[PDB]
Design a protein around this ligand. Structure first.
Ligand SMILES: Cc1nc2ccc(C(=O)N[C@]34C[C@H]5C[C@H](C[C@H](C5)C3)C4)cc2n2c(-c3cc(OCC(C)C)ccc3Cl)nnc12
Ligand SMILES: [Mg+2]
Ligand SMILES: [Zn+2]
Length: 341
């Protein structure tokens, strides 16, 4: 009855103005993880309203309220891949809309699909990666390993199962063509969140940025959607040092738990997943330099107003260098004991 009462309030109390959430809510400086989790479903509705999706697509309010709650409920509680991750990703999507004028690049339905996909893009994550599904012979690998992107195929299927739950299909009044289009977009966008996919299309993303975005080019729309999605997924890096440091802590707790499971199964975990080997500053510098920074550089190349995003990610990368020396124990530990040897 908890979800029941939550739904009742979401529906009958009305959608709070986005400004009432926080005065800097639509700024790139805002940290959505600062929002209490109990306020996040209402904030999703607020953002949807402010982007005019509810009016433009005549979304049924009861259905939308149920959908948002079901999506939130469809996340488990690992250290990083939980609802607060999906919420913050979705918030960054809203920030791109508010700050970068997406309507000059993308169709309305494409922006709508990007935001809905942000909400659903890690549904039912179990705190382990694609490699672990295959190594552990999980049910997800049995279903999808032959296709690849095992977890991302699962996330997308979970999103569809929510839509297919009675009372939850926010698109069910759509035309046949628009419905098919929306689900196709969600497939493409969610599958774009596999790092393997990003690596595959990276040269194409570069070539798009250098020749220039062509709104009449259907391939450019698809590539831009992939880039924007990956920008949202990594958007914790575009905030202050405190956010970056906290997210590293959640990510490596999640990783080392997987690593401990791999050790128990007799397998040699990835080094970044092995708490006995992993050197966090060097790992994060490598992630920032090889993955995060090139993505926000592409974003800047395509959207000059995204410059501050790249500069912040580069700044956070430099901070890891600055604090790395603190991972060396100098003098004695605080307890004046060398017992830990
Ligand atoms: C702060 C931070 N650090 C990270 C450090 C390492 C890795 C990570 O998975 N690295 C490897 C390890 C192995 C060898 C390489 C290929 C894969 C196996 C992944 C790199 C990811 C990190 N990460 C993510 C992240 C992003 C995801 O989707 C990414 C798409 C959307 C682009 C999926 C999962 C995560 Cl956890 N979000 N934030 C972070
Ligand atoms: Mg994912
Ligand atoms: Zn994610």
């Amino acid at each position: 009855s908890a979800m029941d009462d939550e739904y009742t309030k979401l529906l009958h109390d009305g959608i709070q103005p986005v400004a009432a959430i926080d005065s800097n809510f639509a700024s790139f400086t805002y940290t959505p993880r600062s929002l209490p989790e109990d306020d996040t479903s209402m904030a999703i509705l607020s953002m949807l309203q402010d982007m005019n999706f509810i009016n433009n697509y005549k979304i049924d309010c009861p259905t939308l309220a149920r959908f948002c709650l079901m999506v939130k409920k469809g996340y488990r509680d690992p250290p990083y891949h939980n609802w607060m991750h999906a919420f913050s990703v979705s918030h960054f999507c809203y920030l791109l809309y508010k700050n970068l004028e997406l309507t000059n690049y993308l169709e309305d339905i494409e922006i709508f699909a990007l935001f809905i996909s942000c909400m659903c893009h890690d549904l039912d994550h179990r705190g382990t990666n694609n490699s672990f599904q295959v190594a552990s012979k999980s049910v997800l690998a049995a279903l999808y390993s032959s296709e690849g992107s095992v977890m991302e195929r699962h996330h997308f299927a979970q999103a569809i199962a929510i839509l297919n739950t009675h009372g939850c299909n926010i698109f069910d009044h759509f035309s046949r063509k628009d419905y098919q289009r929306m689900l196709d977009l969600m497939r493409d966008i969610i599958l774009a969140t596999d790092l393997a996919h990003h690596l595959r299309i990276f040269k194409d993303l570069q070539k798009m940025a250098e020749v220039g975005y062509d709104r009449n080019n259907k391939q450019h729309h698809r590539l831009l959607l992939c880039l924007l999605m990956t920008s949202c997924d990594l958007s914790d890096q575009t905030k202050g040092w405190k956010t970056t440091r906290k997210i590293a802590e959640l990510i490596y707790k999640e990783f080392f738990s997987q690593g401990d499971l791999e050790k128990a199964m007799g397998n040699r975990p990835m080094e970044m997943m092995d708490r006995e080997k992993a050197y966090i500053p060097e790992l994060q510098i490598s992630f920032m330099e090889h993955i995060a920074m090139p993505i926000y550089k592409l974003l800047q190349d395509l959207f000059p107003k995204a410059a501050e995003l790249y500069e912040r990610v580069a700044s956070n990368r430099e901070h890891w260098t600055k604090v790395s020396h603190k991972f060396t124990i100098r003098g004695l530990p605080s307890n004046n004991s060398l017992d830990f040897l």
